[PDB]
Amino acid sequence: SGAITKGVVLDSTEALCLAISRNSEQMASHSAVLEAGKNLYSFCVSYVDSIQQMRNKFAFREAINKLENNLRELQICPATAGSGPAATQDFSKLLSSVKEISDIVQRLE
């Protein structure tokens, strides 16, 4: 994927975003946005090591962290989320998290 940059990172944030958009086209799979989710957090995390900004790296980086704990709750969990009957499929949070990260890098580098 090159050397892992914001450009590559974006493609990863979008690709997964579509995976979430796929959970409506035909159910798809929660492990799609999740699997792609981890890969993205991975590129970003290894990409922040190039942030020259410094006191601004925290901004973008922390956003990445959000995706970290975002996928975490997105995994499966004991039963807090869905004990069975209640499913609720609105991953708009993953949406706010992604947009945020990008929103920072562009106004950062």
Short mmCIF file of C-alpha atoms in Angstrom, two decimals:
data_model
loop_
_atom_site.label_atom_id
_atom_site.label_comp_id
_atom_site.label_asym_id
_atom_site.label_seq_id
_atom_site.Cartn_x
_atom_site.Cartn_y
_atom_site.Cartn_z
CA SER A 1 0.00 0.00 0.00
CA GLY A 2 3.05 2.21 -0.38
CA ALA A 3 4.38 3.55 2.91
CA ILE A 4 1.12 4.20 4.74
CA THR A 5 0.06 7.84 4.61
CA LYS A 6 -3.11 9.88 5.07
CA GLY A 7 -4.03 9.12 1.48
CA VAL A 8 -3.78 5.38 2.08
CA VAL A 9 -5.45 5.83 5.44
CA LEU A 10 -8.40 7.63 3.86
CA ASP A 11 -8.90 4.86 1.30
CA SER A 12 -9.00 2.49 4.27
CA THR A 13 -11.48 4.62 6.23
CA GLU A 14 -13.76 4.87 3.19
CA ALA A 15 -13.49 1.23 2.11
CA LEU A 16 -14.67 0.13 5.55
CA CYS A 17 -17.31 2.87 5.60
CA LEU A 18 -18.75 1.18 2.53
CA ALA A 19 -18.62 -2.17 4.30
CA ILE A 20 -20.98 -0.62 6.82
CA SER A 21 -23.06 0.63 3.92
CA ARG A 22 -23.06 -2.97 2.73
CA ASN A 23 -24.83 -4.19 5.87
CA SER A 24 -28.00 -2.90 4.20
CA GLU A 25 -27.50 -4.07 0.61
CA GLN A 26 -27.86 -7.68 1.75
CA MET A 27 -26.98 -7.87 5.47
CA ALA A 28 -23.29 -8.16 4.53
CA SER A 29 -21.43 -8.75 7.81
CA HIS A 30 -20.47 -6.80 10.92
CA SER A 31 -17.07 -8.48 10.64
CA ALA A 32 -16.60 -6.57 7.39
CA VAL A 33 -16.50 -3.06 8.84
CA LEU A 34 -14.78 -4.55 11.88
CA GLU A 35 -12.04 -6.43 9.99
CA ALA A 36 -11.49 -3.47 7.70
CA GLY A 37 -11.87 -1.39 10.81
CA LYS A 38 -8.79 -2.83 12.50
CA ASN A 39 -6.71 -2.56 9.34
CA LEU A 40 -7.49 1.15 9.09
CA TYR A 41 -6.73 1.91 12.73
CA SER A 42 -3.50 0.07 12.07
CA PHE A 43 -2.43 2.25 9.12
CA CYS A 44 -3.37 5.45 10.93
CA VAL A 45 -1.53 4.45 14.11
CA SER A 46 1.62 3.71 12.13
CA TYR A 47 1.09 6.85 10.05
CA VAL A 48 0.99 9.27 13.00
CA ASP A 49 4.66 8.48 13.58
CA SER A 50 5.22 10.91 10.73
CA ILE A 51 3.25 13.82 12.21
CA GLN A 52 5.59 16.80 12.18
CA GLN A 53 2.97 19.06 13.74
CA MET A 54 3.59 17.58 17.24
CA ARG A 55 1.15 19.45 19.52
CA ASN A 56 -1.40 18.74 16.80
CA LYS A 57 -0.52 15.08 16.40
CA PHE A 58 -2.56 14.49 19.54
CA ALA A 59 -5.64 15.79 17.73
CA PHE A 60 -5.46 13.41 14.76
CA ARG A 61 -4.01 10.55 16.80
CA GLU A 62 -6.70 10.66 19.50
CA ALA A 63 -9.26 10.54 16.68
CA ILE A 64 -7.61 7.31 15.59
CA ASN A 65 -7.94 6.10 19.14
CA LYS A 66 -11.68 6.75 18.88
CA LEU A 67 -11.87 4.23 16.04
CA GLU A 68 -9.96 1.84 18.30
CA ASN A 69 -12.58 1.74 21.07
CA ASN A 70 -15.26 2.16 18.40
CA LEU A 71 -14.52 -1.17 16.76
CA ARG A 72 -14.15 -2.54 20.28
CA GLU A 73 -17.81 -1.97 21.14
CA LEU A 74 -18.62 -2.87 17.54
CA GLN A 75 -17.17 -6.36 18.03
CA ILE A 76 -19.81 -8.41 19.80
CA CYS A 77 -19.77 -7.83 23.58
CA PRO A 78 -21.44 -10.14 26.16
CA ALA A 79 -25.04 -9.01 25.64
CA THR A 80 -25.08 -5.31 26.54
CA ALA A 81 -25.62 -4.37 22.90
CA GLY A 82 -27.99 -7.07 21.68
CA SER A 83 -29.20 -9.76 24.07
CA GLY A 84 -31.27 -11.24 21.27
CA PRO A 85 -34.55 -9.49 20.35
CA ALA A 86 -33.20 -5.94 20.06
CA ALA A 87 -30.73 -5.71 17.18
CA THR A 88 -30.48 -2.01 16.31
CA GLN A 89 -28.33 -1.41 13.26
CA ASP A 90 -27.18 2.21 13.19
CA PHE A 91 -23.40 2.46 12.92
CA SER A 92 -23.51 6.23 12.42
CA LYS A 93 -20.95 6.48 15.21
CA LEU A 94 -18.33 4.80 13.06
CA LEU A 95 -19.28 7.50 10.57
CA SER A 96 -18.65 10.43 12.93
CA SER A 97 -15.36 8.85 14.02
CA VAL A 98 -13.97 8.46 10.49
CA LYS A 99 -14.94 11.92 9.27
CA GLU A 100 -13.26 13.36 12.36
CA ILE A 101 -9.84 11.76 11.77
CA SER A 102 -9.68 12.98 8.17
CA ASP A 103 -11.07 16.38 9.19
CA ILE A 104 -7.94 16.79 11.33
CA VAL A 105 -5.11 15.60 9.04
CA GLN A 106 -6.01 17.89 6.11
CA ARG A 107 -6.02 20.92 8.43
CA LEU A 108 -2.87 19.53 9.94
CA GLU A 109 -0.55 18.84 7.00
#
